[PDB]
Amino acid sequence: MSFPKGFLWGAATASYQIEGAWNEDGKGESIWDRFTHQKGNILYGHNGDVACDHYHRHEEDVSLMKELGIKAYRFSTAWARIFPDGFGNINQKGLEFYDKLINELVENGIEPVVTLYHWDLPQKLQDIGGWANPEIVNYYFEYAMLIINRYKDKVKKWITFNEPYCIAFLGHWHGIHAPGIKNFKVAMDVVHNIMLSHFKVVKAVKENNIDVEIGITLNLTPVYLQTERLGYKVSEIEREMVNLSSQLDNELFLDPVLKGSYPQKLLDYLVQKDLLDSQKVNNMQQEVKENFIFPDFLGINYYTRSVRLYDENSGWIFPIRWEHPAGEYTEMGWEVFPQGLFDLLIWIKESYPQIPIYITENGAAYNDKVEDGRVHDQKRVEYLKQHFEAARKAIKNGVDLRGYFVWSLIDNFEWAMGYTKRFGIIYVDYETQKRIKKDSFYFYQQYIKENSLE
Amino acid sequence: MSFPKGFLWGAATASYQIEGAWNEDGKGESIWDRFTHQKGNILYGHNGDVACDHYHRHEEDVSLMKELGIKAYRFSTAWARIFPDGFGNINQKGLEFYDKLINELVENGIEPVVTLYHWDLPQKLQDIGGWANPEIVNYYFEYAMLIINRYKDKVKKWITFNEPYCIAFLGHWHGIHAPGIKNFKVAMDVVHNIMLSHFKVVKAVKENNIDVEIGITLNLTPVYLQTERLGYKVSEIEREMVNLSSQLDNELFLDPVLKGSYPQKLLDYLVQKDLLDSQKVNNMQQEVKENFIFPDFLGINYYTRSVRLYDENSGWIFPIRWEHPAGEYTEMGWEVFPQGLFDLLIWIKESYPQIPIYITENGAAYNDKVEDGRVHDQKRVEYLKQHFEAARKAIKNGVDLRGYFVWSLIDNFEWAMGYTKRFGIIYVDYETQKRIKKDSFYFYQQYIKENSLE
């Protein structure tokens, strides 16, 4: 046993992934609804208009959490349900739905780790700008406060954001996620606004002496060297050039968390390549350093490592390349490697002051097949075992890791992949919405039950 | 025990991979030398100037074949060594080197399956046009004849070409291989010239009643459906559109082997997309139908399958998609699957009349690490086991397969990958040129010794 007291084992879901009911109860569409309605955005023309009927079968879903036995359930209060506009007028129907969900989560002893945002931004908020517009810093704020003041008696740990790297780069640079923007300056602006909102919420909680714990959740990609894997000798330029891409993937977000300033060298490199403005980076520095406040917790979402060997022959905006080491892979194409997470579990310890660190999302996707009314995924089980050990052996070695949340609960709308990629540990037959507990669901249940003490 | 009598088990090498000596003995550089000298063509700026000293240690290499116990050794007589120009004046020094190699191969009972071309085109031949210029059809011809008439007493099975798909598309369309051309019309021209040379050699052999057997080696990518893997129902447009890409990867070369024509569907599609000329395709059809003659043998180089689900959102010139199923992968990034080959072994049986079929190249690349003066690759062994069974179970089911050649013999210049990817079953320490017999070398030795009778 290495996991400490209060080690928040859990499962994570996103509202738009399972909810549906995009127009019911006066609720306006999400960003994902508008993104998915447009052609060329999702495989096979999918959208979360219906999803898995999480609204109508919320009793069934809470029974699912009860069966899973997760000490905490990481869910996002769908912003658009509670606020169809996103602010101002508040819908008592969506408020009542989330009141019922939260009270029946509390009644069974499940700690609500409410992620105030898990990609389910209301459409009107996207029309006013999304996460690039600095006004959202207040809106989110008040929204969070209205949730917090409503549920501070029952919800104790709040997650400000989920994967600002994915919100900002997959969602706003690569465009595979909603709302499908493809820009790097907009991505940096999203980073700025997300960090400002996180610290504004932290400051507001601290000022009013609210007895809650507030932090931010990131996804961090470790680095391994193929040259060291090759058995050869690493050159200086190799590290000197892997550093920039690693800063893009690792340091760009952790530096404002505790240091309160952006990595200056990356901003200078972007300016020299005309990808970003020096006056803008200085203004971002000034705003961050004025608005910075040390948070309470940090969240980590680890999936895979990025094996990086030095070369100039990619043509990418950062002249490096990626390697494909031999090994097990998933339907998402991700290499399965535990030890990469270990790197982060030490690296953030070395580079930054003491910030409590949480893991909030980790899992693997596999093409599930119905067999005897059941689906089988042993590769998901093996992935989870490996990433369980990667943190257990670590916390034996003096790691301040705080909790691990498994992704996901039920097979559900996996964003641009549509329904083709299934991450959840519960099979849902889309025809009947029947719930079958996979071997991975049983494995997670057994792990939580066996490890966590009384 | 399904492999028939005369199943030509073997190992394959390419001259430029192991030879070096690009300027010795009056020998001019190859196409690969000029391709590699240019920057931006090879990882880490590598070239086959020195390679593994196959020229000076040819006795050591023949001892390697003797140790491996291959019934046949698939090697390419380096065209540039024998003809520094590529034709005309013939160098007696390169002739004597290959005479010594061939006599010491015959002395130990090794059948020389001489691949007349395995990407080692002389540089002057590239300057006059490479495989696009139709004149090579004669040059190759006479070169082959000069080899054939020189070695008809000792070399009985001759391979005209190795992987026209790779010569024409990897070498002349993608540009990763030498000479690094990137064009599709040039690729079709290479297809035309290679097939014409193959049939011209076959006709010349048949006319003069030479006691030899002449064929061609292809590399063919079978197809599997993710929709069927998904458990769903396949739509008509899915098959109708996967057909075109499957024709390009498979039919463009198989169809002229026995039918003596081109797939008209793909030519019409390219014309409608303005990627190819209708007058040119008609002229190609007329020339092929004039010059076509049925060969003796067909060669197959199978590595992996191409999982294809239908969509228009890949951006390729063929609106299909590639899928990443969960499973074992190699350093080359190739999915490991036996059964795809089996699928291929049936298709040619059904789509075309009976032609004897050979497999002449198959293997997997892994990052070998020196440990106790030795390297270990168990994934290569497992890959080979799986692809051995894929054909053994097939030939139990009435397959016309004739022989299988394992790639490769010793780790060597793996083209654009440089020396980073090691395919061979013998570890060669590039510093010392010492030879260590891997577990994969031992596995292939055991397989050949056990399966073949006596």
Swiss-Prot record, chains A, B:
Keywords: Carbohydrate metabolism, Cellulose degradation, Glycosidase, Hydrolase, Polysaccharide degradation. Its EC number is 3.2.1.21, 3.2.1.23, 3.2.1.37, 3.2.1.74. It comes from the Bacteria. Potential to be used for bioconversion of carbohydrates and biomass in industrial scale. Its high lactose decomposition activity makes it applicable for the removal of lactose from milk and dairy products in food industry. Has high activity in synthesizing galactooligosaccharides (GalOS), non-digestible prebiotic food ingredients, from lactose by transglycosylation. In this process its excellent thermostability mitigates microbial contamination. Has high ability in saccharification of lignocellulosic biomass such as steam-exploded corn stover. It catalyses: Hydrolysis of terminal, non-reducing beta-D-glucosyl residues with release of beta-D-glucose; Hydrolysis of terminal non-reducing beta-D-galactose residues in beta-D-galactosides; Hydrolysis of (1->4)-beta-D-xylans, to remove successive D-xylose residues from the non-reducing termini; Hydrolysis of (1->4)-linkages in (1->4)-beta-D-glucans, to remove successive glucose units. Substrate binds at residues 17, 118, 162, 303, 407, 414-415. GO terms for molecular function: beta-galactosidase activity; beta-glucosidase activity; cellulose 1,4-beta-cellobiosidase activity; glucan 1,4-beta-glucosidase activity; xylan 1,4-beta-xylosidase activity. Slight activation by Mn(2+), Ni(2+) and K(+). Slight inhibition by Fe(3+), Zn(2+), Co(2+), Mg(2+), Cu(2+), Na(+) and NH4(+). GO terms for cellular component: cytosol. The active site is at residues 163, 361. Optimum temperature is 75-85 degrees Celsius using p-nitrophenyl beta-D-galactopyranoside (pNPGal) as substrate. Retains 100% of its maximal activity after incubation at 75 or 65 degrees Celsius at pH 5.5 for 12 hours. Retains more than 80% of its maximal activity at 70 and 90 degrees Celsius and less than 50% below 60 degrees Celsius. Half-life is about 11 hours at 80 degrees Celsius and about 1.5 hours at 85 degrees Celsius. Optimum pH is 5.5 using p-nitrophenyl beta-D-galactopyranoside (pNPGal) as substrate. Retains 80% of its maximal activity at pH 5.0 and 6.0, and 20% at pH 4.5 and 7.0. Pathway: Glycan metabolism; beta-D-glucan degradation; Glycan metabolism; cellulose degradation. Monomer. Homotrimer. Has high beta-D-glucosidase, exoglucanase, beta-D-xylosidase, beta-D-galactosidase, and transgalactosylation activities in vitro. Has a very broad substrate specificity with the highest activity with p-nitrophenyl beta-D-galactopyranoside (pNPGal) as substrate. Active with pNP-beta-D-glucopyranoside (pNPGlu), pNP-beta-D-cellobioside (pNPC), lactose, pNP-beta-D-xylopyranoside (pNPX) and cellobiose in the order of decreasing activity, respectively. Very low activity with soluble polysaccharides synanthrin and locust bean gum. Belongs to the glycosyl hydrolase 1 family. NCBIfam families: BGL (TIGR03356). This is Multifunctional glycoside hydrolase.
